[PDB]
Amino acid sequence: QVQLQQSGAELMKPGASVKISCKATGYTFSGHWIEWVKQRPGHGLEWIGEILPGSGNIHYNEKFKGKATFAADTSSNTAYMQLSSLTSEDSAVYYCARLGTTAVERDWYFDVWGAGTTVTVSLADPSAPSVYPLAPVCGDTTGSSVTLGCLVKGYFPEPVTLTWNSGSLSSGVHTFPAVLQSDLYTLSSSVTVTSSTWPSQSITCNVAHPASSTKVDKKIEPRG
Amino acid sequence: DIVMTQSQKFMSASVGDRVSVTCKASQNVGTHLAWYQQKPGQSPKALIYSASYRYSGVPDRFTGSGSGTDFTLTISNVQSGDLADYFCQQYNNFPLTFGAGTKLEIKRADAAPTVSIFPPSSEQLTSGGASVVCFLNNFYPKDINVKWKIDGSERQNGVLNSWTDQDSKDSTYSMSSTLTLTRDEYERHNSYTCEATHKTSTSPIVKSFNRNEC
């Protein structure tokens, strides 16, 4: 199956440069253009440029003239984009995509996309999250179901990964988008289970913050 | 650059309905236009190229029309899986430019929010903080209002809210609201109240607790 695999997330301080990759399988790597696109949160997609592996032909958007350059290694079926002199406005998700095969009509659309590579550029320093259990009010729980929560406060940068009971709890989960205040993020997640399931059976949120190399498990305890 | 404008940010349709997404180009691009579908978190896929030609494998429920500057993607017999973002792309001139996208919402039956309030954990209080969290889960339609009360009087500052995308399984929306005080402030009051107002009732859904209880 035709596929584009992009490299993992990057956290860079401004002024640095970053080089992300895009491995293409399985087709004739030199028979299609590789395209590069940028998506900042709150903005539409921006076209960066394109490269034809093998021939080495390159085209770039003028808005990225001195910012992005492309390369394609035909022996490894891998395309590369490098970004120089990074600033806050370079923080975005970057997609590689294959330019569909076209004839005289010049139908220049993308027929396969990579999953994207997140680049975060900031001078704020990584901070590990505090993970806080949300147990229901000491009072009653009349209903047939009970909702528990997990509050992930004061971390940077995005993202965190949150699961419940190591992922074996997926129904009834709402993980809410993080909110930014000052230079720190806060994230909440709720899980709703049958009243007979908790507290008789344990419930734990599992939080991973790769940028700080941190993992936290918090078992939700009844308050009394 | 040629600016591609999708003036509708959201749209709603019932299963079986017919709905249309519009895309406006700032200059004449003839028929050189493509449409894409991007499901949440998933990789975008091509639907239409050359304004009206379906990409291979795309159901015939997807039709495209227009040429010059005004383009329309029409989705007939809307299905559950069609819950996604749709955006256009011009390729009449380089640099290629895209529209900002239009999210398709699925209509469903009205549903009041399920409200839960949570006091600050003893862990957070140990560090001098005190966040009160209120979940408002699985309601429809998306518009909702949250009001915090401390000792019976409204409280506005220190509140941060977060909303989910439409759930792909039951088509509801959820919201999280967090009131953050210092421990010093938090221990100077007794009653903390979360109040949810939703079109399904003039009476707000009220969840509350007292620092007394246990």
How many Å lie between the alpha carbon of B22 and the closest alpha carbon of chain A?
16
Question: A100 and A154 in one domain?
Answer: no
Say yes or no: A170 and A216 in one domain. yes
Asked if B193 is an interface residue toward chain A (Cβ–Cβ < 8 A), one would say no
Cα distance between residue B39 and residue A111, in whole Å: 16
A40 near B CB under 8 A: no
Judgement on whether residues A104 and A153 belong to the same structural domain of the protein = no
Picking from B98, B73, B54, B97, the residue whose alpha carbon sits closest to that of residue B11 is B73
Among A83, A107, A123, the domain boundary falls at: A123
The one-letter code for the residue type at A218 is K
CB contact under 8 A, A134 and B91: no
- Three-state secondary structure call for residue A63: helix
CA distance A55 to A72: 10
Question: CB-based burial of residue B56 (10 Å sphere; 0-12 exposed, 13-18 middle, 19+ buried)?
Answer: exposed
The structure's method of determination equals X-ray
Residues A144 and A53 in one domain: no
Question: What is d(CA B75, CA A77) in angstroms, rounded to the nearest whole number?
Answer: 37
A110 and A97 within one domain: yes
**Do A93 and A150 share a domain, yes or no?**
no
Chain A residues whose CB is inside 8 A of the B2 CB are none
Query: Are A62 and A132 part of one and the same domain?
Result: no
> First and final CA of chain A: distance in angstroms?
56
Q: Do B87 and A139 touch (CB under 8 A)?
A: no
Query: What is the set of domains in chain B, with CATH numbers?
Result: 1-108 (2.60.40.10), 109-214 (2.60.40.10)
Residues A154, A119 share a domain? no
**CB atoms near residue B107 (< 10 Å):** 13
Q: Do the Cβ atoms of B214 and A136 come within 8 Å? A: no
Q: The tokens of B143 are what? A: 């518009």
Q: Which domain holds residue A211?
A: 124-224
- Quote the CA–CA distance of A38 and A1 in Å, as a whole number: 25
Classify the phi-psi angles of A173: left when phi > 0, otherwise alpha if psi is within -120 to 50, otherwise beta: beta
Quick check: B121 contacting A, CB < 8 Å? yes
* Residue A88 Ramachandran class (φ > 0 left, ψ -120 to 50 alpha, else beta): alpha
DSSP run (H or E) holding B185 = helix B183-186
B67 to chain A, any CB pair closer than 8 A? The answer is no
For residue A180 the two structure tokens come to 């930014």
Q: Are residues A108 and A135 in the same domain?
A: no
Partners of B128 on chain A (C-beta within 8 Å) are: none
Give the amino acid at A30.
S
- With beta carbons under 8 A apart, name residues in chain A contacting B131: 132, 151, 153
Q: Please tell me the distance from the alpha carbon of residue A151 to that of residue A16, in angstroms, as a whole number.
A: 33
Cα–chain center distance at B158: 23
Q: What is the DSSP letter of B91?
A: -
Amino acid making up residue A132? Y
Residue whose tokens read 């519009």: B22
Q: Is any Cβ of chain A less than 8 angstroms from the Cβ of B214?
A: yes
Note whether A134 contacts B133, CB cutoff 8 Å.
Answer: yes
Query: Which among A44, A105, A149 has the least Cβ separation from residue B100?
Result: A44
Is there a contact between B176 and A108 if contact means CB atoms under 8 Å apart? no
Residues B195, A16: Cα–Cα separation, whole Å: 48
A197 and chain B in contact, CB less than 8 A: no
Q: What is the C-alpha to C-alpha distance for residues B68 and B32, in angstroms, rounded to an integer?
A: 9
Exposed e or buried b per residue across A88-126, where buried means at least 16 C-beta atoms within 10 angstroms of its C-beta: eebbbbbbbbbbbebeeeebbbbbbbbebbbbbbbeeee
Pairwise CA distance, residues A34 & B123, whole Å: 50
Neighboring chain A residues of B168 at a CB cutoff of 8 Å: none
Which are the contacts of A196, defined by CB distance < 8 A and separation ≥ 6? none
User: Is the CB of A190 less than 8 angstroms away from the CB of B135?
Assistant: yes
Q: Do A176 and A116 fall into the same domain?
A: no
> Number of folded domains in chain A?
2
Are residues A142 and A187 both part of a single domain? yes
Greatest Cα pair distance in chain A? 75
Contact at 8 Å (CB) between B68 and B32? Answer: no
- Of B64, B55, B56, B58, nearest to B88 by C-alpha is B64
* Minimal Cβ distance to A179: which of B46, B87, B162: B162
Residues sharing a CB contact under 8 Å with residue B75, sequence separation 6 or more, in sequence order: B13, B18, B19, B20, B21, B61, B62, B82, B104
Which positions ≥6 away from A216 have C-beta within 8 Å? Answer: A129, A131, A206, A207
Q: Which of residues 73-132 of A touch B (CB under 8 A)?
A: 100, 105-111, 113-116, 130, 132
Contact criterion met (CB < 8 Å) for A47 and B43: no
Q: Check CB contact under 8 Å for A151 and B214.
A: no
Binary contact (B137, A109; C-beta < 8 A): no
The residue among A123, A140, A172 that closes a domain is: A123
E-strand stretches of chain A: 3-6, 10-12, 18-25, 34-39, 46-52, 57-60, 68-73, 78-83, 92-99, 110-113, 117-121, 130-134, 145-155, 161-164, 173-175, 179-181, 184-194, 204-209, 214-219
Residue in chain B lying closest to A41 (CA): B100
Return the closest-CA partner of residue B36 out of A109, A91, A214: A109
Domain boundary (A105, A123, A141) is at A123
Element (H, E) at B85: strand B85-90
A42 and A69 both lie in a single domain: yes
Provide, as residue numbers in chain B, all residues whose Cβ is less than 8 Å from the Cβ of A47.
95-98
Which of chain A's residues have a Cβ under 8 Å away from the Cβ of B115?
none
Compute the distance between CA of residue A35 and CA of residue B131 in angstroms, rounded to an integer: 45
Q: From CA A137, how far away is CA B191, in angstroms rounded?
A: 12
CATH code assigned at A174? 2.60.40.10
The half-sphere exposure of B123 on its side-chain side, counting CA atoms within 13 A, is 16
Q: Tell me how far apart the alpha carbons of residues A79 and A77 are, in angstroms, rounded to a whole number.
A: 7
Q: How far is A207 from A215, CA to CA, in rounded Å?
A: 6
